[PDB]
Curated annotation (Swiss-Prot):
Forms a beta-barrel structure that accommodates hydrophobic ligands in its interior. Keywords: Acetylation, Cytoplasm, Lipid-binding, Nucleus, Phosphoprotein, Transport. Lipid transport protein in adipocytes. Binds both long chain fatty acids and retinoic acid. Delivers long-chain fatty acids and retinoic acid to their cognate receptors in the nucleus. This is Fatty acid-binding protein, adipocyte. InterPro entries: Calycin, Fatty_acid-bd, ILBP, Lipocln_cytosolic_FA-bd_dom. The modification Phosphotyrosine is found at Y22. It is found in: Cytoplasm; Nucleus. GO terms for biological process: brown fat cell differentiation; cellular response to lithium ion; cellular response to tumor necrosis factor; cholesterol homeostasis; fatty acid transport; long-chain fatty acid transport; negative regulation of DNA-templated transcription; positive regulation of cold-induced thermogenesis. The keyword Cytoplasm applies. Belongs to the calycin superfamily. Fatty-acid binding protein (FABP) family. It comes from Homo sapiens (Human).
Length: 134
């Protein structure tokens, strides 16, 4: 038993609320928002030693990040921001902070029932994307 055992596995997107507005807050352009909005990505979470890997796969783009909890890393986002990212574990919840150009967004992943719930926040604006086991 470990840190992120309840996160590990293959997950598929089943619902999304307020995603377009979150993207607008983040600065995503029109064409990228429309493409992002169609996608039903799979999210593959694995653990090896202290290293967590999260891959996101979709028709558009496959991304992947590997990190250690608390250690800052360089990340290219799906919309092509170059950001400074730190992921930590806040008692059960994976808390992902992305910092760029004086701005900051926070993405929280938590297990609720059989769901992996992804909560995305920037300034006022919150989007909720719900995943289930593939
Ligand atoms: C095919 C996809 S999927 C996707 N995004 C996601 O799937 C996200 C999450 C998830 O559910 O994993 C949580 C954060 C965004 C984007 C995309 N996102 C963004 C900015 C908001 C970052 N721009 O493009 C695109 C082109």
């Amino acid at each position: 038993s470990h840190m992120c055992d309840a996160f590990v596995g293959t997950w598929k997107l089943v619902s999304s609320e307020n995603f377009d507005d979150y993207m607008k807050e983040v600065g995503v352009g029109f064409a990228t928002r429309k493409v992002a909005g169609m996608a039903k990505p799979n999210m593959i979470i694995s653990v090896n030693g202290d290293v967590i890997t999260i891959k996101s796969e979709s028709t558009f783009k496959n991304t992947e990040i590997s990190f250690i909890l608390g250690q800052e890393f360089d990340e290219v986002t799906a919309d092509d921001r170059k950001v400074k990212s730190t992921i930590t574990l806040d008692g059960g919840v994976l808390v992902h902070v992305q910092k760029w150009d004086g701005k900051s967004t926070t993405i929280k992943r938590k297990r609720e029932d059989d769901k992996l719930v992804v909560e995305c926040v920037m300034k006022g604006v919150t989007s909720t994307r719900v995943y289930e086991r593939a």
